[model samples]
Target: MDINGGGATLPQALYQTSGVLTAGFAQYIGVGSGNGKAAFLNNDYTKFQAGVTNKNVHWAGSDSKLSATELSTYASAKQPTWGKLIQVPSVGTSVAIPFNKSGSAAVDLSVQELCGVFSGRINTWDGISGSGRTGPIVVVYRSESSGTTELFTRFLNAKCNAETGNFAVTTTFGTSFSGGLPAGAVAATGSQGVMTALAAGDGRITYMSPDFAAPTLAGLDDATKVARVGKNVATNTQGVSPAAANVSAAIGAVPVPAAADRSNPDAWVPVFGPDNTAGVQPYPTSGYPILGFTNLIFSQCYADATQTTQVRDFFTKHYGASNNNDAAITANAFVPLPTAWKATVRASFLTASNALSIGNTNVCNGIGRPLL
Candidate 1:
C-alpha cells in the first residue's frame, strides 16, 4: 500500500518508524496533499494497488478538505467513496522567526503584525515591537499544493476578512501561494525546504509545523523560536504559545463532523482556528490560534475481500484500540486523538465492504469527508 500527502512530517516519520512500511502493508510517500490526491484519483492499479483490486492508490492525505466544488464534482462523477483514515495529531502551525543580529530573544507577533509581515505591510524586523532584529522581513511559504498553506491561509483569511469587513483572500491549496502572499516572498517545496531556508538566515520567518522545525532549527544554533501569537479570539489575553494546552484548545474548537454533513456531496468538513465561539477557546484575547490536522484518506469499499481485510487490519494495528502507539505518537510531537475518535475511525475501517458504494451514513462518523 502506498499512502502520500504533505505537511505532518512528524507523522510521516512516525509511520516509517512503526514498521508497517517494512511489514509490507503500506508505504508512505510525502508528496504534497494536492499531488497525493491527484495520484490517488489517477494512478495505475495493476502496478501495485495496495491489495485493492479496483482502487489504484490506497490513500491520499491532506490537512484540509477537498474544495467544496471538487466534492460536488465527485458526486456528479459517481466516484468511489472517500473518508478519514485517522486523525493524526498535529503541533499546529507556527511562525518560526530568527533571532535579531543583536542576539535579542525572539519576539511575539500581534495578529495585525503577522498579517502585515506576510502581506508586505510590516517589511522589517524593527517594524515589529520588542524585536532586536532589524532588517527586511523575509517571508517563506510552501510552494506546492500544500495543506499547511491552506490551513494557515484559512486562518489568515478569516481574521483579515473580519478586520477589513470583506473577503480579502480566499483559497485552499495549489502549486501557488494562497491568499496573495506578498510578491518577493520566498517559496519552498515542502516543510523541510521551508525550515532549511529559515535555518540558513536571520530576519526570516515562515509558517510551518513545530516538530519538523524544532530539531533542525535548534541544531543550527542560530536563534530561532516559534513566535508567540496574540490570541484575538474573544475575552482571553494571552499569546498563543506552542504549549500542548494551547494547541489542544485550538483543535478542540473544531466541531466533529456531523452525520448529515458527512453525507452531503458539497461538504468538505474542515476545521478553522481562531474560533471565538469554542467553549474553551484558548487565549481568547490577544492570541492568534493557527492549527491544522493530518488525515488518512481511504475509500469506503474495495474490489475484493482480501483487499478490504488488509486495509482494515493496517489501520487497526497501528492506531486503533487493539494496539497502542501513543509513545511513538508523542515522540513525534503529535498528540494522539481521543480514544473515542480513534474508535470511530477503527470501526469504520472494519465496516469496509467489497462493493464500490458510499452509503448514506459514512463509516468514519466524526471525521469522514470526500476526497478532492
Candidate 2:
C-alpha cells in the first residue's frame, strides 16, 4: 500500500530511508507541514499519515484539540491519529554560515545574539559580540509552514524573553512570525531552500534541518559551515554543540508528558529542548541543541484489515528500530531514538486500540515504563 501525507523536512531522511528499505511499503511525499496536515485531514490517501515536526495538530484557526467542529470541514470519516514516531537527535536546527567570511573565530552564538539577528536588532557579524567579522548579516528564513521554523522559533520564544528582545512564536507552519520576521529577511522555500539560498550568497545565515544541510556541505565552498550555538546556560547547560551525545542528552531532558496532558489532544505537544535544570548532566556548554521531535501521524482504524496490517508492519518492522536500517537514519545525520524510547514506540504499536490514544499507556497492558 502507498502511504500518503506530508509535513516537516527534518524527517525527509527517515522517510526516504524507509522508502528504500520497505521497497514501497512506506512512502512520504515531501511537502511543507501545512500541506501535509491538510492532506491527512482531508483523507486524501491510500495510506494516510503525516510526518510533522511541530506539536500543533489542530486544523487552521483552531488552537485547541481537533474538535468535531474542526473535523466537520474535512471530508474524512474520522480525525487523523497522532503520536510521537521517533526521538530524532536532529543536528541542532543548524545555523548555517558562509565560510568565506571571518571575524571572531568563534562560531558560538547565545540565545540573545540569535534573537538580535532574527529580530533585526543586529544585522552585522561584528554586531554579534564575540563573533569576529565585519559585514552585513544576510538573514534567510523559511517562506512556508516548516518544522524547522516551528522548532527554532520555539527555542527562541523560550530562551529569548522580552528583556532579551523577542522573536515571535506561532504554531502556524509558515515564515509568518507573530511580530513578523526581521526586516529584509530573505524567505526560502523550505529547509533545502534555505540551505541553497545561504550557500549562494556571502555573509548569509539561515536556520535549517541538519539532514539537508549535512548533504549540502560537500558541495559548498570551504568557508561554509554550520555555526555552533551557545547552550541555554540559565535553564540548562552552557555552550553546546550539536554533538550526538549532547543532542541525545538534550532530548533526554524532556520529561515524559503528564498523564492528563497526554490524553488531551490539544495538550499533547512534544517539548523541543532541555530545560536549564534538565537532568541530562555533564552537558556540553557550547553548541545549540536545536531538535525536531517529529511524529508519524496516522489513524487507529483503516478501511479494512489489510491497510491496517500494512501500516502496522511498516511501523513495527521497518520504521521502528526493532527491524529497521539504523544506518539509513544515521546516514542523513539524524540520531535514532534511545532504546527506552524505542520500547515505548514499539508498545505504541501493540494494538490498534492503543494506537487511538495519543498518550494512553494503559494500552500498554501493565508493561512497565521503559528506562530513561
Candidate 3:
C-alpha cells in the first residue's frame, strides 16, 4: 500500500521528514527532477532511472516547473485516461555555492564575478584576486537534467547574459555555458554526485541545496566551503550567505497563486531578474541571489482504489492545519508555503468533484494511465 513517488533530490529530505508520511503508505526516491516530470507525465516509475519499478508513481516531486510542452505531451499522451495533471508548489529553496579550497579564507563574489567563474571566463582562482587560493578552477556541475541547474542558470541568464557575462538558461548545467562545457569542467550525475566532486578536489565549486550545505539547515554555516554572493555588483553591498533565513527573506514575497492559475507552471515560479525602472518589477534584494520553488506533481484521479486513498490522505496531512509542515520546512532548510496558497491548493484541488481530486469515479473510476 505504498504511495510511491520520486523526484528532485533538492527536497527529498523535506518529503521524508515532513511527518505526513508517518502512515508508511508513502515513499519517495531521489531521482532528479527531470525524471520526476517524465515519470508523472508518462505515469511510469521506471522513467526515473534512480527509482523503484514496483509500481506506477502516484506523485512526483520536482524543483523545476512544468513547461507548457510537457503539459501538452501529458494531455495528449496520458491525461484523458489518467485524469487531470496538477502541479503545485510544495516548498521554496536556496541555491548554495559550495567550493573546495586549500586556503582558509572565506570566498565572496559579486554578481559579475560569480557569472565569470561559472561561465568559464574566470578559469583560475586568482583571477578574482584575494580568494587566498591559486590554481585551476574546477567548475563542477550536474551532468543530468536538473531543476537546480534550471534555477541557477535562470539567475545567470538574467544577471550575466549580456556584456557582463555569458550564459543561457538551461536544466542541464553542462549546456548552460555559452559555448559548451568548458575545459576542466567536471560533470557529476546527481546532487550528491556534484557534492562529492566538489569535495574531491581543490578549487572546485558547484551549486547545491541549502539542506546539503548545512549540517543543521540554519545559516548553512560552513565558513570554508560555501561562498557569500553579492546582491548586485555595488561597492557597498556586502556579500550575503544562503542561510535558511536569508533564502526565506528573498522568497518571502512570492506572489500568491491565482485560484485559476494553479495549473499553470509558469505562474508558480519567480521572475529571476532584477527590478525594473519605476519599481514595476520588484525582485527582493536582501537575501541569497538564486532561489526558487520545489513542486509536487499529482493526478486528479488514480487507477487503484488504495493508491487514490493514500494520495488523498497524504495531501490531507500535508496541508492539515495541525501539520502545516512548519517544523519540517524550516528543519529541512526550505521555506514553508504561504498560508493563503496552501488554502487555495487544499480547497481547489482536494475535493470530491470529478473536475479534480483523487479517486473521482466520475472521471477515472478504477482506470488509470496504461502501462505500455
Candidate 4:
C-alpha cells in the first residue's frame, strides 16, 4: 500500500507486510480476515487470509485511511488481538487551501470549530468562506479507500459532534458507508486526484496527506493563487510552499492517544483540536495534525506455508539479529521500532499463538492494539 507521507514508512512496511502475506506463516493455513498479515498468525487453517502462502491471495491497498484506525472496538478488546507494528505512521499535516487568496474568513477554515461545517451548510463558497472566492467552494477529497479520510472525519467528529457516527473515512471520499454519505464534495480517487481537483478547480477546499500536498501544488498549472486556509489570521497551516518542519510544527501541542502508562500524552490518535471544546475553539495553526501521521492496521493470519514462513521470517529479520535487514528500515522510508519494542511484540505474537483456543477463536483477542 502507498502511504500518505515521505517519512520513509510505506516502502518498509510494504516489504514487511507483503512478505508476511506471501512468504510468512500465512502459507501454512488460511486466516481470511482483512489484516495484512493475519492469515499467517491467527487462523484455524480454514479462513481466507492475506499471506502469500495462499496462492489465491493478492493484495489491493488504498491510501484512504492514511494510517489511522477505528479504535472503539480496539479499546474494548479484553485481550489484545494483533501483531505489533514496526513503527508509527507519522501524521503529516494537510491543511485546507482556499482559492481566492484574499479573504480573512478563508483564513479561519482550519479552525476546529468548522468540523463537518461543509455539508448542507457548505453548498457554495458563499456557504463556507462567504465571498472569499469568486466561485463555488469545489470540495476536493481523496477518492480511494484511505485511512486519511478516516482520520480527517474523526477529526471532524471530534470537533463537531460525536453523535455523527464518528465517521470512518474509507477509500470512498467524503462519504461514510455506516452513517450514509455526505454531498457537495468532489471525490478524487487518489492523492493526485484530490490535488489535481483542487489545483484545477476555481474555489476549492480539500484535504490530502503531506506527500501529495506539495506535488499537488507544484503540479498545479496555475500555482500563483493557491493557498491554505489559516487556522487563524496569524498562522496559515499550509504556506505558499510546504515543508516537513512546517508540517510537523502545524501538528503541534495537540492531545494524542495515551500510552499504556497513560503518562505520555503524545501517542497518536485522531486528535480533535488544540482544545477539547467543540468547534468554539479555533484551530491551532501551529498544532494541526491533519495529515500528521498515517495510521495502520495489519492482520496476524494467512493462508500459505511458504508465504507465511517468508512473512514471519522477514519481520524476524527486520527486528532480529540480521544487520542487513535492520539497516534497510530507513532505506524503505520506514522507521524501525526500538529493539526492545520489536522484541516485545515478537514475544507477544508467540504468546498469542500459544493462547488460541481450538474450539473457538476471535483473532481480535489474539491480535489487539500494539503496546507501543
TM-score between candidate 2 and the true structure: 0.71
lDDT of 3 by residue, 1-372 (tens): 566688898888877774646454555788899988888876677875444566667778888878879978888777767777778778778789888886677677777788888877788888764478788998999888898888788787777754433677778887776666657898888788888888888789888988876556543655467888873434556677887778776566776765576556555554455556331224457767678778888887776666677677777777666655778888888888777667667776677762555666776765664433
Q: Candidates' lDDT values, in order?
A: 0.51, 0.49, 0.74, 0.37
User: Distance (Å) between predicted and true CA of 254, model 3?
Assistant: 0.8
**Poorest 10 consecutive residues by lDDT, candidate 3:** 274-283
- Candidate 1 lDDT score relative to the true structure: 0.51
| Candidate 1: tens digits of C-alpha lDDT, residues 85-117 | 222322233323332234546566777787777
Task: Give the clashing pairs for model 3.
Answer: none
Looking at model 1, residue 347 earns an lDDT score of 44
Q: All candidates' TM-scores?
A: 0.73, 0.71, 0.89, 0.49
Cα lDDT for residue 113, candidate 1: 81
Q: Could you report the Cα RMSD, in angstroms, for every candidate shown?
A: 6.5, 8.2, 3.0, 9.7
Ranking, TM-score, top scorer first: 3, 1, 2, 4
lDDT by residue for model 2 (1-372), tens: 343434556666566664433433444456666555564564443212335432222211111123344345432344333323212121222323333354436456676777777777778878865556788887887777665666667666665654334455553423334555566667778567777887777777777655665554342222225556663446664454453444655555544434444433333334443347442222223434455455554544443334445555655654365566555655665556656555554554444455433223443232211111
Best by lDDT: 3
Better of 2 and 3 by lDDT: 3
**Rank order by lDDT, top first?**
3, 1, 2, 4
